Design an enzyme around this catalytic site. Structure first.
Site, PDB file in Angstrom:
ATOM      1  N   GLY A 189       0.755  -1.317  -0.089  1.00 48.23           N
ATOM      2  CA  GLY A 189      -0.063   0.100   0.103  1.00 48.23           C
ATOM      3  C   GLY A 189       0.834   1.272   0.032  1.00 48.23           C
ATOM      4  O   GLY A 189       0.378   2.410   0.430  1.00 48.23           O
ATOM      5  N   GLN A 190       2.052   1.132  -0.404  1.00 44.23           N
ATOM      6  CA  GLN A 190       2.871   2.219  -0.603  1.00 44.23           C
ATOM      7  C   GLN A 190       2.387   3.425  -1.635  1.00 44.23           C
ATOM      8  O   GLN A 190       1.495   3.043  -2.448  1.00 44.23           O
ATOM      9  CB  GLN A 190       4.330   1.917  -0.804  1.00 44.23           C
ATOM     10  CG  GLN A 190       4.994   1.478   0.594  1.00 44.23           C
ATOM     11  CD  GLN A 190       4.920   0.124   0.996  1.00 44.23           C
ATOM     12  OE1 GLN A 190       4.154  -0.583   0.350  1.00 44.23           O
ATOM     13  NE2 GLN A 190       5.517  -0.144   1.935  1.00 44.23           N
ATOM     14  N   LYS A 191       2.749   4.607  -1.507  1.00 45.26           N
ATOM     15  CA  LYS A 191       2.472   5.495  -2.401  1.00 45.26           C
ATOM     16  C   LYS A 191       3.113   5.229  -3.945  1.00 45.26           C
ATOM     17  O   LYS A 191       2.020   5.264  -4.737  1.00 45.26           O
ATOM     18  CB  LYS A 191       3.153   6.824  -2.125  1.00 45.26           C
ATOM     19  CG  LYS A 191       2.407   7.300  -0.912  1.00 45.26           C
ATOM     20  CD  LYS A 191       2.982   8.907  -0.535  1.00 45.26           C
ATOM     21  CE  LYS A 191       2.433   9.334   0.686  1.00 45.26           C
ATOM     22  NZ  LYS A 191       2.733   8.992   2.039  1.00 45.26           N
TER      23      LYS A 191
END
Ligand SMILES: Nc1nc2c(ncn2[C@@H]2O[C@H](COP(=O)(O)OP(=O)(O)O)[C@@H](O)[C@H]2O)c(=O)[nH]1
Ligand SMILES: [Mg+2]
Lengths: 164, 184, 299
Positions: free
Chosen positions: B69-71
């Site tokens: 769920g990282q940018k």
């Protein structure tokens, strides 16, 4: 969340009674020195500028965002960092530290301790025989041979920083 | 191809499903995936990309794809939308400041083309925390009533203790089995 | 059958590849025994699911070893291809490694392959598939490359350009590896960064190959088949709003290839397949409103 916010030139402090298995959140802190003597479950240090945070063991994760000229020293299972420039961290990770959009980070071992640190490590369900501070992954740099220019190790002659 | 082989292929494909796990970072996706399988939780590290797992539940072959769920990873989520039967959207209850960001993220995942016909199971992770928002709070802050093109259903859980995890997958399977499955 | 009974025998045969790779006297018998043992599950490959994870770990540890000779790594690639054709590539390559660190090593292997070596084609095929598995990472190729200007004068070639060149070189071979390249076309040209820098180029090259190829020579036919397969994969595993701006140009070249009058049955099938993917690019997907009220998923 249980934590301070919107403070300046304030040296805050907590005890194990108000830190045990409780998510903590810091926001908008400038020139402040916090001292948490307990075992907070999670920790979130956001918008920090010239702040020294000395927290005890953290059972789950420590998140850092928009930090600059900070001095962190906390043990946990994972350390997430986003947008951070020039910020020393005395880290004791049981899993892995990750960095994103960082530049100039300095990693060093963990040496902070207080009289009751022994009864607080037992509350973190952590393993004292695990320390992978010298193995951080970079999301912006994923090379094989070349190293990551966004994080390095602090020399042994710069690790004797005053804790006052 | 005759009818016998066509029916055989249809039955073989019917026994396979896809459950894409999405959500913001530091939510507890890897923790939930490890608790549902029975692995150890003390040795879990953030995904530097995406992990895949396969198991069998109630005779159905479940293939879970836990994406980070990282940018810098959201832009690549489109690479995991092909053949998606279920979407497990994890939301951290303690995370109250980034909620607005977690509402925009789940809202755009619903206007996709490949994810049109696929069940939605929202897990409110980290419910046993002091400042953990309730189910109604997360349902109202993310605007779940406005959803009408997908069968959604909120349900809190806690991977640290493995609670309310089997009911979610059971409901997902029941909803998947309620509709007809046709090849393409 | 019901379960896998030849477990110890298969384990011993897989742990014997390190003493039957030099001379072919005990190399052919092992392959024959493995094929005979695997053919029994050709109709029930689902009964191998719980054994195809540990067999792939043993097979990968041999090819990943730097001290594993060419003859030893090629033997491990034949067994992998056998397992793939037995069970299935769609269900077998999904479990293969997919980390980031496995992006540079694997590619390097693909660079040390001779396309004119029919005695090790199984190595060139499976390898390609493994590459397609390392394009399901949510990062960019520029981040993995880092600094390319590290050497004086001679600059380093990025991973994206290397993958593009490899794909362009193997979509026009006669062997089973062309097919593998089509897998990489659906995993490389459909990426977010690769599409932004390798979509106009790859679509101009494909149109040129379709325009200057004949269905009356052996090579031209292979190139046309490879280009059609690549276009079909792009239109299938690709987006509709990234691929719609090209569907009119492609349709025209396809119609110009006068395929419905060729005596090549496989070219006509590829043309029809490419004609339905292009067409579905002109219309938005709809959903059966009639579900949830006319029958369950099973019976
Ligand atoms: N307190 C608490 N922490 C959790 C729970 N589930 C996961 N975590 C922790 O949250 C952190 C982030 O988890 P992780 O699986 O890396 O999430 P992901 O990487 O975002 O999918 C980890 O340290 C987990 O141990 C929970 O139910 N309660
Ligand atoms: Mg994870």
């Amino acid at each position: 969340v249980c934590g301070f916010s919107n403070l300046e030139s304030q040296v805050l402090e907590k005890r194990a009674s108000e830190l045990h298995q409780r998510d903590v959140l810091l926001t908008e802190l400038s020139n402040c020195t916090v001292r948490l003597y307990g075992n907070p479950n999670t920790l979130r240090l956001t918008k920090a500028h010239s702040c020294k945070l000395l927290c005890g063991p953290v059972s789950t994760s420590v998140f850092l965002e928009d930090c600059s000229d900070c001095v962190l020293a906390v043990a946990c299972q994972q350390l997430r960092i986003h947008s951070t420039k020039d910020t020393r961290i005395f880290l004791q990770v049981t899993s892995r530290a990750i960095v994103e959009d960082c530049s100039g980070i300095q990693f060093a071992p963990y040496t902070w301790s207080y009289p009751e640190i022994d009864k607080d490590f037992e509350s973190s369900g952590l393993d004292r025989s695990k320390n992978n501070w010298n193995d951080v992954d970079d999301f912006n740099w994923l090379a094989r041979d070349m190293a990551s220019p966004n994080w390095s190790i602090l020399p042994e002659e710069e690790r004797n920083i005053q804790w006052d | 191809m005759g009818l016998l082989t066509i029916l055989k292929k249809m039955k073989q494909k019917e026994r396979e499903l896809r459950l894409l796990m999405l959500g913001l970072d530091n939510a507890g996706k890897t923790t939930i995936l490890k608790k549902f399988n029975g692995e150890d939780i003390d040795t879990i590290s953030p995904t530097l990309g995406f992990n895949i797992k396969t198991l069998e539940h109630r005779g159905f072959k479940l293939n879970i794809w836990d994406v980070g769920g990282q940018k810098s990873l959201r832009s690549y989520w489109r690479n995991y939308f092909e053949s998606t039967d279920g979407l497990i959207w994890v939301v951290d209850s303690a995370d109250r400041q980034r909620m607005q960001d977690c509402q925009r993220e789940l809202q755009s995942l619903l206007v996709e083309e490949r994810l049109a016909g696929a069940t939605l199971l929202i897990f409110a992770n980290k419910q046993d925390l002091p400042g953990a928002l309730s189910s109604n709070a997360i349902r109202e802050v993310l605007e779940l009533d406005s959803i009408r093109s997908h069968h959604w259903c909120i349900q809190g859980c806690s991977a640290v203790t493995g609670e309310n995890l089997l009911p979610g997958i059971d409901w997902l399977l029941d909803d998947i089995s309620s509709r007809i499955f046709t090849a393409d | 059958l019901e379960a896998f009974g030849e477990s110890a025998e298969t384990r011993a045969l897989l742990g014997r590849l390190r003493e039957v790779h030099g001379g072919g006297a005990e190399r052919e018998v092992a392959l024959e025994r493995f094929r005979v043992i695997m053919d029994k599950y050709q109709e029930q490959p689902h009964l191998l699911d719980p054994h195809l994870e540990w067999m792939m770990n043993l097979l990968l540890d041999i090819v990943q070893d730097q001290t594993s000779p060419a003859s030893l790594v090629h033997l491990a690639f034949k067994f992998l291809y056998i397992i793939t054709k037995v069970r299935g590539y769609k269900t077998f390559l999904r479990l293969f490694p997919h980390e980031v660190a496995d992006v540079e090593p694997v590619l390097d292997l693909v660079t040390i392959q001779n396309p004119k070596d029919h005695e090790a084609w199984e190595t060139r095929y499976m390898l390609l598939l493994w590459l397609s598995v390392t394009c399901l990472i949510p990062f960019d190729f520029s981040r993995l490359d880092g600094n390319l200007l590290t050497q004086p004068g001679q600059a380093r070639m990025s991973i994206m350009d290397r993958i593009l060149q490899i794909a362009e070189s193997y979509l026009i071979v006669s062997d089973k590896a062309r097919d593998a390249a089509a897998v990489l076309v659906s995993r490389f040209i459909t990426r977010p960064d690769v599409k932004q820098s390798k979509m106009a180029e790859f679509l101009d090259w494909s149109l040129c190959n379709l325009a200057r190829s004949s269905f009356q020579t052996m090579q031209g036919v292979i190139t046309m088949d490879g280009t059609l397969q690549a276009l079909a994969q792009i239109f299938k595993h690709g987006k509709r709003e990234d691929c719609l701006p090209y569907a009119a140009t492609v349709l025209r070249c396809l119609d110009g290839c006068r395929l419905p009058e060729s005596n090549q049955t496989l070219l006509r099938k590829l043309g029809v397949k490419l004609v339905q993917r292009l067409g579905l690019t002109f219309l938005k997907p709809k959903v059966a409103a009639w579900r949830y009220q006319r029958g369950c998923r099973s019976l």
